[PDB]
Nucleic acid binder design. Sequence first.
RNA 1: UUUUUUUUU
Length: 195
Amino acid sequence: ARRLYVGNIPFGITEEAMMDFFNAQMRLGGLTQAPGNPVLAVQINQDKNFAFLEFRSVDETTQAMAFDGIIFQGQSLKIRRPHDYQPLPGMSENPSVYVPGVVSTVVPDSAHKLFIGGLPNYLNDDQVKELLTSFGPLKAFNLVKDSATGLSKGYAFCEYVDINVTDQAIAGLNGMQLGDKKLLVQRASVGAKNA
RNA sequence: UUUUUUUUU
């Protein structure tokens, strides 16, 4: 895929200012495979609050994914792959089925994103992040705000650099009393319990 | 407001 989905983009951001930023991130990081800018175009859906990046190569696109969660103009960008990948109802389940095509040779130690809820609606990114930082530096953090309203929805996602600290972060934060709400913290995917 | 608005402008 020579395309990437980038949501939670800054308001009023221009397509060109989205391009110049990514191309300048690809160069600073040295993630380019050949001379020239990787990002050829960017399309922004202002109302929907998202944009799509268009790369010249497939590998470069797969390299820009490392910028998921990067801070740009106070907004933590959400980078994902397009959804042109459909279930494809062609019938005769053989190249699909379920397992065939994605058996997974062996998933590496990854995915330790944490879900945080019960957060007061008045706290902002720099306040919430602080409460989380008290256990160690974060590698990715995003506070969900209403599309129109713009205020906190009451829950945010975060991931530390040192995953082990992830477990320590849940045991000390989960249940914490914030205002008139009870904080909730659990692995955003699997791991809401501890054996 | 306890799981984060994906398209060929």
